[PDB]
Symmetry: D2
Amino acid sequence: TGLLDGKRILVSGIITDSSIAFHIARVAQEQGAQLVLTGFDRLRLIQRITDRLPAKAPLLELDVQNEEHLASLAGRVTEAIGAGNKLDGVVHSIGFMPQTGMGINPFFDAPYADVSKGIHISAYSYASMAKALLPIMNPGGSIVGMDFDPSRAMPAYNWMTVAKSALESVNRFVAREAGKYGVRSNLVAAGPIRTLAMSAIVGGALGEEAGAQIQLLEEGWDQRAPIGWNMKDATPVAKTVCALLSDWLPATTGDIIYADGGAHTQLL
Amino acid sequence: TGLLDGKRILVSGIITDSSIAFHIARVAQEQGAQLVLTGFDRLRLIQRITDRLPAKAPLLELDVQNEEHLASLAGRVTEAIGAGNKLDGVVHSIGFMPQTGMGINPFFDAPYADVSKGIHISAYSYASMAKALLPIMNPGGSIVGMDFDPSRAMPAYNWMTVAKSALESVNRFVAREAGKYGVRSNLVAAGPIRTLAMSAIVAGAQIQLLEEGWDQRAPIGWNMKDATPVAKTVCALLSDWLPATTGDIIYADGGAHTQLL
Amino acid sequence: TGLLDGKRILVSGIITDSSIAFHIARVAQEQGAQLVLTGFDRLRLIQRITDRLPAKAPLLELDVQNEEHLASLAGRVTEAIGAGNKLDGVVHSIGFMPQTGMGINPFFDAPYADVSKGIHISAYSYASMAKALLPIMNPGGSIVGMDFDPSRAMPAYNWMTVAKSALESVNRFVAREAGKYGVRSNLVAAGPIRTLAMSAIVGEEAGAQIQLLEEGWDQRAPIGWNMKDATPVAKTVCALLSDWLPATTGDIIYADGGAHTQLL
Amino acid sequence: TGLLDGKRILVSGIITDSSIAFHIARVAQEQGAQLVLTGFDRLRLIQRITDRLPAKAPLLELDVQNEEHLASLAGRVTEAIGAGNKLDGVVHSIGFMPQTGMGINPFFDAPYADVSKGIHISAYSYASMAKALLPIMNPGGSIVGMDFDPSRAMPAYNWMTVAKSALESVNRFVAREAGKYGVRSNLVAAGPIRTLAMSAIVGGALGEEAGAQIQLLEEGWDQRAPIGWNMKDATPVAKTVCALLSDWLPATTGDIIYADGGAHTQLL
Ligand SMILES: NC(=O)c1ccc[n+]([C@@H]2O[C@H](COP(=O)([O-])OP(=O)(O)OC[C@H]3O[C@@H](n4cnc5c(N)ncnc54)[C@H](O)[C@@H]3O)[C@@H](O)[C@H]2O)c1
Ligand SMILES: NC(=O)c1ccc[n+]([C@@H]2O[C@H](COP(=O)([O-])OP(=O)(O)OC[C@H]3O[C@@H](n4cnc5c(N)ncnc54)[C@H](O)[C@@H]3O)[C@@H](O)[C@H]2O)c1
Ligand SMILES: NC(=O)c1ccc[n+]([C@@H]2O[C@H](COP(=O)([O-])OP(=O)(O)OC[C@H]3O[C@@H](n4cnc5c(N)ncnc54)[C@H](O)[C@@H]3O)[C@@H](O)[C@H]2O)c1
Ligand SMILES: NC(=O)c1ccc[n+]([C@@H]2O[C@H](COP(=O)([O-])OP(=O)(O)OC[C@H]3O[C@@H](n4cnc5c(N)ncnc54)[C@H](O)[C@@H]3O)[C@@H](O)[C@H]2O)c1
Ligand SMILES: Oc1cc(Cn2cc(C3CC3)nn2)ccc1Oc1ccccc1Cl
Ligand SMILES: Oc1cc(Cn2cc(C3CC3)nn2)ccc1Oc1ccccc1Cl
Ligand SMILES: Oc1cc(Cn2cc(C3CC3)nn2)ccc1Oc1ccccc1Cl
Ligand SMILES: Oc1cc(Cn2cc(C3CC3)nn2)ccc1Oc1ccccc1Cl
């Protein structure tokens, strides 16, 4: 018994083998899921990465800003999994924000063109993915997205914080639409994980006073967490996501599950 | 196969076969857990009820107000599950509030003696259960308790609402202590279920409209006669599959709390 | 003694005399504030409306989407209030969302161009107003914006709900920047008010079912809620403009008759 | 001129001149309120303290655990302010917790007798004060109580944290009852202030590996606060309470106002 025996799950957002999306996929496969992967921009490079997953799985190009890709997605998936099958799961593990909206760059200096692009990719896309894919989702199934607790402002995360606050609201509306199909929609609010986006968008959003000032702030998780937090281990987050994909949280929708070692429950 | 293969889990709070505790136990057993049950006052009557669970399991008396029962509990459990074993799970599904602190009885008329008793049984006991049982819990294991969303005031629930607000805080402190043992502590905030205590809150058709301030709001709906979804949600926290969630609250309420209408 | 004796406060967002902005301004003036008003697009029509306030006050064009207006705003205000003076208060009472992102139009059908425009006007603008104006704000002063509780999803409000969730986050970051100047930044989360924009959420054909949902305020509110009376909201905003909430920033104050504290 | 011209306001919880209650009273009087003070146990000593307020004001004995004092309070107040008058305001600035429920003493080791006492005094009393006083309150008036943000667990505050979580719920119920009279009920959630209860119940709830560990946690306010926090200045808190007593927050009940320099809105 896999936790996800014979479930068909789409997984977006793999780019390196540190990606949260990757570990979600590895764990979903270990628990008997047959996957359909999506990737953005660097398909050849993503394909080397996905070969390292425990099982082969079809790979589809999806740039959540591409009108045509979303219009096509529903059909490209049906053709990848077998005509007359549907998905039981969907994982949105996608984010972006320009350099201007992040790190040491003044919050007031981010121009709206740039903020808008981030909100498009990191928040609105959760709705446009749900729109494209609900028609090919079974009753019982689960949409899951990735969140970083935005309830309080923090240094550096800046306009991404705002995108996550938007995503949180988007998720509650998707839950309403998804409800008509017997589908749940939830976010996992993870603690920090060494992934590409952490480094090149955030660590590289500061340079010098930079990446050791990542470090201290992120022990505003390991310290607070009553069971601790390990930034190098995505397994706990991946498992938490699989739990939402499974049949074992069947009464939770529009909601947020914290995979953060409990840190958000503790002030110190 | 089972979500909880070979896990040893204590389950408090069974009294009838409608009890949320009962369905937790049934589902935990269906997923391969070996249980140890706790019950209060009416042990003879509880035992007829537990015979209807899929498997037999030892039953132990625990009145969370009884000094001696808590002091003894740790050892009475070790003897029930095998000397040299420990628990992997603990479920607190316990509540009480005098009639004065609930229903049509004015909120201002509940005397503190009565409120205090409710807080003792419904909130503090979560801490005293955790104290008694953490020394016999394995790393990885989960403590779970039952909550009803107290963030907003509502008619009838009155001083139980206040007990739940207290319980929510108690849970976050237990998580700190439980953390030293590698143990998670969480609450499930369930939607309404027809149980004995629900009867004990108070005509009972005015309950009904307020409780469709769940089925209505819930994007996937809510069925007050079906505890399965709640029981499954609890088992999820008992399992290895939410390993980075502690001090926290999980809403098994059909999503109702995320919707204003 | 006015609550706001000799305070200089900018007030955006007036368009009719039902506008929440209007009642904020009336109450600020009743309490001794000298105002500087902003309006968008229909300046001639806004000016008839502002003449009905207890005192006349200069009116400046501000379209929060206009690069040049924001760059210029700081100086156009300094010239309106006296060179070598500054503002003590700023009120953002601005919102917009295309028809597609709202009412009976499916949530999944709003194209991002349209959502983005709403977020620009309703959320980002709070930051760009703060950017333009903090250099000419005194220590002690208050920035205030208008919110509608987005914590929970609801029918109709749709993508405006998402804009408010964004605004709530934006406000906490503005508070950080405003802090360097000795300035507070807060939002008032008001209950519903019969204003122009409220009619703009459907029209009609759905818009009587607004009413039941809005008694998910008057019913819940332990002191009730009157959709025709903006006074309580205007006063709540003035409280934040005053010296009497000096240790509250990045935050949200509910002027909703207590409705958000009650499930029923 | 005064923010509270000719308002009649009861103020509980004065014991030293560092008491938050004291500064509430001083500020209420500076803004034209006529007060009625309550005090507990050490009435002679409280009376030296209240003589230092800008105006004299009658002092009444109130031990919120005393059946008879609450039953009598309503009438003892009517007699202090004039027959045929009523109160426009009530300030609950009261708390207590045994040593066992606090500081270095293990959370698990507090016996319920002791926790119960704390909950009685710190939370339930808000309801029993409201019960005693609403019959002699005018429409428009305000009940206000003092809170310390209990939404996340923290070191030391222990079972007082639980009392405040209870108080927050109690306040929402009081608001419903108070609503029938046209009365608001709110809490102010203050940042830390050097008061007696801080020191002898909390700083002295540790002694040796002790009251300097309070210190780090309390700069989990001045640091986070975008406009900073001064533990020696109760004025900002007292003013915030007066704001709720005034006519200027007339649409806010059942609620919580953070007078904490914004710290609770900031993760770092
Ligand atoms: N790493 C953390 O600490 C952390 C914690 C919580 C939440 N998150 C969130 O987790 C998610 C995944 O990020 P990650 O840290 O695993 O990093 P990452 O860089 O591994 O993954 C981000 C992904 O977004 C993709 N992407 C960007 N623009 C896209 C577009 N137009 N179309 C489709 N995909 C696009 C990238 O190709 C990449 O695969 C994001 O939503 C992020 O906000 C990250
Ligand atoms: N049914 C609902 O709608 C609902 C909703 C949310 C939460 N809950 C919670 O679920 C838990 C159980 O409620 P239920 O509805 O399943 O109830 P129930 O009435 O079927 O069972 C309640 C139990 O309370 C226990 N109990 C009371 N005082 C005790 C004491 N001193 N020591 C030990 N046991 C004692 C009994 O063993 C009894 O089985 C409670 O914490 C309650 O708040 C119930
Ligand atoms: N009315 C309510 O029930 C209610 C409740 C909560 C919050 N609010 C908020 O109050 C604020 C004002 O709304 P209202 O209900 O008084 O309505 P309204 O229609 O009276 O005012 C909206 C204002 O926004 C201005 N505006 C729109 N686009 C602009 C732009 N590009 N640049 C500058 N100004 C622009 C308009 O010119 C108008 O002055 C909004 O932020 C709204 O969300 C209203
Ligand atoms: N000091 C802080 O930093 C801080 C911050 C936020 C909230 N609080 C809360 O503010 C309130 C006031 O505390 P403070 O710091 O002014 O302290 P304090 O020691 O100055 O005042 C506490 C008061 O408790 C009263 N009290 C104790 N037992 C009582 C009883 N049985 N009946 C009546 N009164 C009783 C005493 O008379 C005393 O005046 C409390 O509710 C406290 O929890 C304290
Ligand atoms: O959303 C994320 C959260 C985190 C956790 N995090 C935040 C921070 C900043 C210093 C506060 N550091 N780590 C890491 C990467 C994240 O991924 C992204 C961030 C911005 C844009 C795109 C992505 Cl995928
Ligand atoms: O904690 C519960 C919550 C609910 C939910 N609920 C509340 C209500 C009334 C309308 C407020 N109806 N259902 C039912 C039973 C519950 O169990 C108890 C309630 C009071 C006292 C003891 C218990 Cl076990
Ligand atoms: O932000 C508002 C909230 C409200 C309250 N509200 C909610 C609703 C529908 C029931 C959900 N109607 N009114 C009215 C006008 C509001 O102002 C706007 C709404 C949408 C777009 C632009 C503005 Cl300014
Ligand atoms: O409730 C309080 C909160 C605060 C704020 N605080 C708590 C703490 C220590 C970190 C836990 N430091 N400041 C100070 C005094 C407080 O007053 C009491 C504490 C326990 C019992 C009675 C009172 Cl008045």
